Symmetry: C3
Subunit: 279 residues, 3 copies
Amino acid sequence: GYITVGNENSTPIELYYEDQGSGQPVVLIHGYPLDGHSWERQTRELLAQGYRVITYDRRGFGGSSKVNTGYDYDTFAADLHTVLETLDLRDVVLVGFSMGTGELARYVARYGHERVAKLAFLASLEPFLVQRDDNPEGVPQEVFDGIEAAAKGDRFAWFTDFYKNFYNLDENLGSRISEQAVTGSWNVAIGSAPVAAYAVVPAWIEDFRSDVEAVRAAGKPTLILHGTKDNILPIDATARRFHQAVPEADYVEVEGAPHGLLWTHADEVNAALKTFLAK
Amino acid sequence: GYITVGNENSTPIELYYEDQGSGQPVVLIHGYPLDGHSWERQTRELLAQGYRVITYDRRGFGGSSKVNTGYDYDTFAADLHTVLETLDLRDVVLVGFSMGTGELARYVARYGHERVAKLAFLASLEPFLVQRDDNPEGVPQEVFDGIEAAAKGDRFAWFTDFYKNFYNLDENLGSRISEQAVTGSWNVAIGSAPVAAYAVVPAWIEDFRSDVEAVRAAGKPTLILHGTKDNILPIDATARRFHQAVPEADYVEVEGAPHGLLWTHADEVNAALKTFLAK
Amino acid sequence: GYITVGNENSTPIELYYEDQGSGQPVVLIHGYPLDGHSWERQTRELLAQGYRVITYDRRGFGGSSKVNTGYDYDTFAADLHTVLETLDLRDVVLVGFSMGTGELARYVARYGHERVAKLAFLASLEPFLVQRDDNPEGVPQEVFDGIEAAAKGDRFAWFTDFYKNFYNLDENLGSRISEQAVTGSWNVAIGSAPVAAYAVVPAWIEDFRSDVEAVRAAGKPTLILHGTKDNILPIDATARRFHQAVPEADYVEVEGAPHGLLWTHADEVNAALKTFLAK
Ligand SMILES: *[C@@]1(O)O[C@H]2CC=CC[C@H]2O1
Ligand SMILES: *[C@@]1(O)O[C@H]2CC=CC[C@H]2O1
Ligand SMILES: *[C@@]1(O)O[C@H]2CC=CC[C@H]2O1
């Protein structure tokens, strides 16, 4: 399916989406540089549990418009807003992974939570990833400069390097992810808009601390889950701070898990989601 | 092109199709987990012979909607019915390969044969693939349980294993199919809906024996063709039984050919189709 | 985005396109067997320079309709005409690479140059690639017969062989193009219509000498640029003749560059385009 969310010059900006099952709506928002199918190990369990599972592809990724403009969380949240309004979804469970955790917080901040039943943040960006004078716990900017340069330099070679650290392949290749599944991740990645390989990096490092305040103040059931061997979003720079800021949220650390834990630790992610959604 | 065949929640179910050439219509219905382009070695010959060649992608595959629902032959036949009615095709030659042989028989059974000139069944599922008390010639259920588990377990690795047996790669890699062509088969396969990797397996093992009765009773020119080294659909469990049940059909055994014989034995398939269509 | 340019039987022929930025329009027309994203190293620089950059995918390639008909430059030029008219583009800079250089010349010949500000021909086909009695400087027909046979014989294996010569991989793999970028070129190539792998070859060898007359007589700023180690379109059979025929055009030979120089020699291509567009 497609939902129109804007225009880029003479072209409509259309987001690809899937809408499956019956029951309470659950919207799953994927990470860079994948698409909605990256949720497949979660999707099939949620459908079996009697939820209506919707995924969509972020602008620039998967089946969505390969735009040059709007790679920022205000726009990403406006896109999500249009998806929810177009489908008139109510009592929705929003679940974000990696980039998708930014949509969740920015959406609540900008649009409120009238449509939202629950929030689940998996392998989160929050609260503010890049080190600044007022954000000493962040990661130094030079890391992101280097990522931007590599992704712009040759996105094809860059995605290979990214997935090594995404999945901790030195540890997990052949035990928790096959070579073929890694290849599938890379084939999806190179289908993204060339500019999206690097244009999203400034978005990853936006300050979400005010959005975290909105999330906490919404008082909706919230889950925060992260792997302890995450080499993309270090757990001390993200989830542990997020947990401190939103102490009311359910909090899960998946021992030994990398950033790409929807696949490598699907069982643990699924168990956490099942418990959380049942509440 | 796209033809709408139904809806999945808020999304239309659209089948991708191509419609080429001029002359009597010939509709080619591909096998799992490929798409309409898998017919390319046949398509170009049929076009050269002065047929109008139409292919479409089965729901869940190729360019068609990546649905969760309807992976059964009643639905697959209803999809084909809508394609034929939408295009108002008459005097059509229907040609199925592997999964596509199920559409042909179920379509005739459910909708009759007013639009159909001829039927060609290549590497067929018929008459009833899984062993049961009333179907002693079938293959034991545990085979299909294992396939379902592998395809659900990691579809990316599974498609590699499937294509080894599909093409008999130990024998044919480098002689009747290149490494690059195998890679092309795998790239198409992983584009299918994640759930479709395993959801189609129960469909493969539906009982087609009543549909075979409808096909035989239609009295239209029919061709049944199969490879003698088919390690996906064993010739004794399928084509030889189909031939016994429909003795009036033209019958071709391609000596030494695997399941993936549209590619590996394109010349033999093309020669059979040319003779059959000329009748 | 899509622009409808015709019909193939029951299906509209739709060209995929992107329309980005603001400023004077620049339309980039890709080479075989790639798509509009193959321009990414040029696109991002032109956008940064304040141009509106439009790319589209030629029929049969990338995201455009996978047709069987119309693989000839009269049709390719008519497609471009429809793109320019549909978008009502004026003062356009047309830039062609490899196959795309044919659209530029045939378009001016068939439709004139009222909408055109400038023409840039990169790695050009012109003036007439195949040797004939009246074209002694061309390449012998047997070369193209062999290419057609290989591309029809197994397009998957053929694209591997093509890209070796396209990029001069013996020299450039690991220094000016990564293995991963080559893989990205091959993944895009195999998505093209099967018939397009070979149907375009007769188009490449059309006589463009009359079109070159139209281009020269238009008196618009023109650039001709070619690599000196082009092993697809030999520089003496193409660019040097084109330069002799249109002596008024700016002329650039990129020392040591292969056919695939948008990637391998992006800096040199970009510098030439920047200078040319600034005029
Ligand atoms: C996920 O999948 O999306 C982005 C944002 C967070 C870390 C980098 C990348 O991984
Ligand atoms: C073909 O291509 O489609 C299915 C059905 C028959 C055997 C398994 C698979 O192969
Ligand atoms: C480019 O990319 O397109 C065609 C036409 C010219 C030479 C062969 C091929 O390369």
